[PDB]
Ligand binder design. Structure first.
Ligand SMILES: OC[C@H]1O[C@@H](NC(=S)N/N=C/c2ccc(O)cc2)[C@H](O)[C@@H](O)[C@@H]1O
Ligand SMILES: OC[C@H]1O[C@@H](NC(=S)N/N=C/c2ccc(O)cc2)[C@H](O)[C@@H](O)[C@@H]1O
Ligand SMILES: OC[C@H]1O[C@@H](NC(=S)N/N=C\c2ccc(O)cc2)[C@H](O)[C@@H](O)[C@@H]1O
Ligand SMILES: OC[C@H]1O[C@@H](NC(=S)N/N=C\c2ccc(O)cc2)[C@H](O)[C@@H](O)[C@@H]1O
Lengths: 810, 810
């Protein structure tokens, strides 16, 4: 039907049809009379997966013969989403499958909707890992993603009476056709026990054993026949476990609980023993696998030439002392050489500056769980602090600031300090974030070792985030500049020479309109809600956090509502304001914010005077598959974190690529997006990092803003008095109290500039032609934010490997 | 290679080879350089399973069009064993697969050894269910086996220092290629709650819900293209389960524990809540499925014409009040009509007379767990007892004897009494057993309703138990009488006219010798033990129980040893004495018996004076796959239970069919085996049922035997003094104490006759020609003990359906 979706050749279509029927019959054990849509989805999944096999086998064969340096990306999160459409896109099968299913009397789109997301992540950090895997394959790198196969991913969110309820994400219930179990590469992981000292070395003994069983999922590159591996570990009890009898068998669950569930905290640290176990489990199994592969290529001097380990935040930081443990205790290398190998092997990526998000494990936990690792950590700290003492003689305060061991009521290990010490590179995820690392939280470390510190601005894959979710945009672009931009996103710059082209302007705007109509229809069907598709689609989608300032958006919404009620017969640009995202189950303020959003909707959406001029919708169960639908339909992208708090953001880049304009603070990657597009093509408002610092010195007084802005005072009085909760008038007192007396993120200080900047958005929207020309200038300059660029920089600047765009033989 | 294993046609062999390679590539994701024996097994399993699909689909289609009466066989146990070879046998694929694998450079036998048993049963009752499914398919009956998919089957037994250790039977670890998950037919099962009475009916409310997810396994008939279904339920938590957050997800395990593990008790009742839950779980899910299928054919009068439910012991006895619950509470039928339907639908098979094996559930358990069922049971009891009162006026003691409710310290429900009341037929499993039911434990019920009581003597399938495990015997038989006996085992009678045929005598004996050499080689390879293949193979394999009198065998063994040590230079017929079987983990005496057996071996097998004249071996981990190996190699079958205690036995029939002679008491099916073969062709010894009763009246005094038999006294003095346990001289005091003072099974009373009868065995073995002629007379008369005969009798006499030998279209 459309060009970018590949060829629908006669032989390919015939071949897909017959393999589809074969799978329906032999694999699913059904015929056409009894089959449900789900059976049809599964027959298609199996038909598609068959095309990965040859390439997957030959790619891994290739790495064995060529023996390139291997990249190991260790993450506790891989937020993959759905796999069917992505696989078709990367193999150029989409149009052929569309045609094959059409002739079988099936709608492929309807079948696509049946697949559950692999929701093995919380948000941005987990999605980054997934985008990275795609780019690593597309760039021909010998890369492996290693993580945990959680039985339950991020919870499904239901909204009940305006409140978030959680339900278990039982994503494996019907079976996962995209994975291959590899029980033959099952490995032991050790826990607890004690340290014994012998004549020649320490020994870790009397351990409890848990088995790590790998499941491999293929990662196809974009049309290059490269198929890499994501290996996810599942926890299994050994067979003599606990071995009255009935209870011993039932207690196997305790061991297997390690891989049961993803911790649902976005940007918050919870010092729970189960989480620690998960962190060690992935690290111990992965390293054994790494070393096995390295030996099957004694000379551990070549280890760093053949191995790179990337730590996705501090979550797999135990990789550092585990590598040391294996090299010293088992391989019998001397400490200093083992350490040299470790540093040159490992690199650490930091994803946050929020103090509450930094992992600081209590010493008593590590003592019981991983006694040898603690000993190794103490030894690392002693030797590191000796270097600091020598570089900064007599600077006693520097010593306690830089120590891996934090003193206090409970002694803790600072995992970030561990990571910096045991890595040859440390990067932040956007230029301002990386600068904040050098200037503030890791200042001491940067002064000791400036060479270690780097920036790698985040990106998103243009395969999932343009071609897959916005085929109509991808196609109107390809008609003018060809298809090569899909794996070389800098080519979008060529679109600048079409900014005054009347045909292109019309087409860009038509595609957006079609996406909005499709999403507006989606909302009615599955959620019975009415929206005006002519309105400006104002969307804020991301995890619910105080720092992300969904509350600032709320205040804007109420301001608009109050202004309409003030002058009802005045013209306003109509808006559909959509806010979505999950709150962490324990995060009370975030749950209150959700309730506020729905409570605002209840008032606004039923006021007869408002009409179809303002709608407020809470987008339930925001997740990768939902992002793929709402992002292409958006006009306005809300990126409004307090400057200095969003390390990068990636949602921001998704919106930019799909034809939304951005209202945002100079925070995270927003700064670089504004720089690429030009500041006149971005709706920038609010305090910069320096303004925040100035206010912090002086002291943030929210009352000042309340006193001087009458529109803001009215909103606070509405919230307090029970205007938005008539039956429970004090419902939102926690929110008012926080805003007035305890606001770490200074919502009030940015309110005036935000509202003003929002008026400028509405003005531009009144002029369809100029709105669209600014949109074109955003899409045209979004090339930098491809994860192919990001990964090319990791490869050259950290891992010491060259990317390749060459095809492997088909 | 051999005739009975089917044709190896050029097209079939070519087709198997290519489908094998296709599966190795697309299914397993391997090539020939990396594949292990297990991968090769799995490629073959998938290649074979593909041939079941068309037939499986068309068989179930057929039942839908013809709407025959359906048979539902409800069991908590299905001891299936391995499936690969059985599938090949029933589809006539064995020689073709053998040839296909040979040409790929593979030994199919070696691949067969890789498959784990489906060990979903304890022993005879579980194996009976499996044999029945095979016969039901072979006889063209519309039959379904319903049970539980246990994650852990019967434990693997390891012997450590002579003691049984248990390890979890993690049989699903590598995935089960023979099942198809059917998550779409998932059904709710209710637990706990309370009973509310409304204007129109009782209602069961506030229940905890557990989901029942079915897995279907095909059951192929022998060469008739009929493929029936075994449906096994797995327990799943609902998704809002318990729904702080992390714990709620982890607590899902509590619900899913229902299908976790098989209770390892053979012939013993343990009143554990988890077991009760398992019993209701299978019953509730199965009945919903039954009723669904019945409606998709309001007129519940036709229910019994379209449905038969067979209860395999009392384990699924809750079927009776559950059917009543559904018919009264949900369908709103009046009690009396619902009851009529129930009785005509249900039939009960009893498998034991041991009082400790009868299920008697505490009232307080049913009250909490199944409050409505208890109410229904009370109502059944009241109405049943009113019938008894009317038939036997003033017989107050009869009333309390027949009550479903037993009074005492704890009130209990007698599940056997429930079953008799709610069933139109009650059968025992061998003629003497069924007679014992009418004369003793169910005497009162037989007097009230003599028409209900029947016999159905057990059988074994000749597919697994001759063709599969003894191809060499099957072939020498087929050479003379054709292949038709495989599904008409009465034809073995034709072999009587070959009892003096010199060629046949030679061939029968050659096959046994070959089987003995193969098993003797098997023992050295996998267990490093030396045996003399010229010796008489004396085997007792079955679960370890006091009633089965492994101890009587032990005493014989020691007698032989003592006699040799007495007259070392006298000739004795050499014996290899093999004893194997699992003990229930809680059963202390059974565990002591195992230790005695190994301790005897330790002494006998290392005495230089004994030589290769006597060997005592404990066969570790006895299970279906091991039975298939040892039974064909056996010369002497030990069936030596105290008369009145073994309801039937089926092991006995397996040995008879495979060319072993039987030494046994007149107990269970032994009586009918002796009757078929002629008593001169059986080694019968010991007390009959009547002799046991006589001794019981008088009082069993073990001391009498100890005093009067000097050979027996010596053995007791050896056991007591520590001859068989020099380091722990008092090790066997519990055993001696039991034999001397507390022996329910009268081991001593049968000792003299046993030893004497064993001398007569040795004498016959000295005459190879006459041994073999007696063997021929056993095999020739083993036809009665085919489960095809058994199932034909259930069909005609209980279920009201005609068996059919006709082929369905291929
Ligand atoms: O069908 C559901 C089951 O599929 C199996 N996969 C098997 S047996 N082969 N898979 C091959 C394969 C997987 C991914 C591909 O891209 C290509 C082939 C997996 O190992 C199971 O974990 C899963 O439950
Ligand atoms: O391969 C391992 C997996 O196989 C799946 N089976 C599938 S997807 N199809 N099975 C078809 C089938 C089964 C038995 C047959 O005899 C014929 C076909 C089962 O549903 C899973 O429970 C199992 O783990
Ligand atoms: O670089 C990718 C993205 O990473 C996110 N960080 C996230 S989602 N978690 N960051 C830290 C963290 C997460 C879970 C924890 O349990 C502890 C720390 C940042 O907040 C984003 O600004 C950034 O775009
Ligand atoms: O009919 C088949 C076979 O059934 C067996 N009975 C068995 S193995 N269990 N019988 C009762 C029982 C089992 C487990 C329980 O938890 C309770 C009762 C009998 O002991 C055999 O003599 C007979 O051949």
């Amino acid at each position: 039907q459309i060009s970018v979706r590949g060829l629908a050749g006669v032989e390919n279509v015939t071949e897909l049809k017959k393999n589809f029927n074969r799978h329906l019959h032999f694999t699913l054990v059904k015929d056409r009379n009894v089959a449900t849509p789900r059976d049809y989805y599964f027959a298609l999944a199996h038909t598609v997966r068959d095309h990965l096999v040859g390439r997957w086998i030959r790619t891994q064969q290739h790495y064995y013969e060529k023996d390139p340096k291997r990249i190991y990306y260790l993450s506790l999160e891989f937020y993959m989403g759905r796999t069917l459409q992505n696989t078709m896109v990367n193999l150029a099968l989409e149009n052929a499958c569309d045609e094959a299913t059409y002739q079988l009397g099936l709608d492929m789109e309807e079948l696509e909707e049946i697949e559950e997301d692999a929701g093995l992540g919380n948000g941005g950090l987990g999605r980054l890992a997934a985008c990275f895997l795609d780019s690593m394959a597309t760039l021909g790198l010998a890369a492996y993603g290693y993580g945990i196969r959680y039985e339950f991913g991020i919870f499904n969110q239901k909204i009940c009476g305006g409140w978030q309820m959680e339900e278990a994400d039982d994503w494996l219930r019907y079976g996962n056709p995209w994975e291959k179990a590899r029980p033959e590469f099952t490995l032991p992981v050790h826990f607890y026990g004690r340290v014994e000292h012998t004549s020649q070395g320490a020994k870790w003994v009397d351990t409890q054993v848990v088995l790590a069983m790998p499941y491999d999922t293929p990662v196809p590159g974009y049309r290059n026949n490269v198929v890499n591996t994501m290996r996810l570990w599942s926890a299994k009890a050994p067979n003599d476990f606990n071995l009255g009898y009935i209870q011993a068998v039932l207690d196997r669950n305790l061991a297997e609980n390690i891989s049961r569930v993803l911790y649902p905290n976005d940007n918050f640290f919870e010092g729970k023993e189960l989480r620690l176990k998960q962190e060690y489990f992935v690290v111990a199994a992965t390293l054994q696998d790494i070393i096995r592969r390295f030996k099957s290529s004694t000379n551990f001097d070549a280890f760093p030439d053949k191995v790179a380990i990337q730590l996705n935040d501090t979550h797999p930081s135990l990789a550092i002392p585990e590598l040391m443990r294996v090299l010293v205790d088992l391989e019998r290398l001397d400490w200093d050489k083992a350490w040299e190998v470790t540093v040159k092997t490992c690199a650490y990526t930091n994803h946050t500056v929020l103090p509450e998000a930094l992992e600081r494990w209590p010493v008593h936990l590590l003592e019981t769980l991983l006694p040898r690792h603690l000993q190794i950590i103490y030894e690392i700290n002693q030797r590191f602090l000796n270097r600091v003492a020598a570089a900064f003689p007599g600077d006693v305060d520097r010593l306690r600031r830089m120590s891996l061991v934090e003193e206090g009521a409970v002694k803790r290990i600072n995992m970030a300090h561990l990571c910096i010490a045991g890595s040859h590179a440390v990067n932040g995820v956007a230029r301002i974030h990386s600068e904040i690392l050098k200037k503030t939280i890791f200042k001491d470390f940067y002064e000791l070792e400036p060479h270690k510190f780097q920036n790698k601005t985040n990106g998103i894959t243009p395969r999932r985030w343009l071609v897959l979710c916005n085929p109509g945009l991808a196609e109107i672009i390809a008609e003018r500049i060809g298809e090569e931009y899909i794996s070389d996103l800098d080519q979008l710059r060529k679109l600048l020479s079409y900014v005054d082209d009347e045909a292109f302007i019309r087409d860009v705007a038509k595609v957006k309109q079609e996406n909005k109509l499709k999403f507006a229809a989606y909302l009615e069907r599955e959620y019975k809600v009415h929206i005006n598709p002519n309105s400006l689609f104002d969307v804020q989608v991301k995890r619910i956090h105080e720092y992300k300032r969904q509350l600032l958006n709320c205040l804007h919404v109420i301001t608009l509502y109050n202004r309409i009620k003030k002058e009802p017969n005045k013209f306003v640009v109509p808006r559909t304001v959509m806010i979505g995202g999950k709150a962490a189950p324990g995060y009370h303020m975030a749950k209150m914010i959700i309730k506020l959003i729905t409570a605002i909707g209840d008032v606004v959406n039923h006021d007869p005077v408002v009409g179809d001029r303002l709608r407020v919708i809470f987008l339930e169960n925001y997740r990768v598959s939902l992002a793929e639908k709402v992002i292409p339909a958006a006009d306005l992208s809300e990126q409004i974190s307090t400057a200095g708090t969003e390390a990068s953001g990636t949602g921001n880049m998704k919106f930019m690529l799909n034809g939304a304009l951005t209202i945002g603070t100079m925070d995270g990657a927003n700064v670089e997006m504004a720089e690429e597009a030009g500041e006149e093509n971005f709706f920038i408002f609010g305090m910069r990092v320096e303004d925040v610092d100035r206010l912090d010195q002086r002291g943030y007084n929210a009352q000042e803003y309340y006193d001087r802005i009458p529109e803001l005072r009215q909103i606070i009085e509405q919230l307090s008095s029970g205007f938005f909760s008539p039956k429970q008038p004090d419902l939102f007192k926690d929110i008012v109290n926080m805003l007035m007396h305890h606001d770490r993120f200074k919502v009030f200080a940015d309110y005036e500039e935000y509202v003003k900047c929002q008026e400028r958005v509405s003005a531009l929207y009144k002029n369809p032609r100029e709105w669209t020309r600014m949109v074109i200038r955003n899409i045209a300059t979004s090339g930098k934010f491809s994860s192919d660029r990001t990964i090319a920089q990791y490869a050259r600047e950290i891992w010491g490997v060259e990317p390749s765009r060459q095809r492997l033989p088909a």
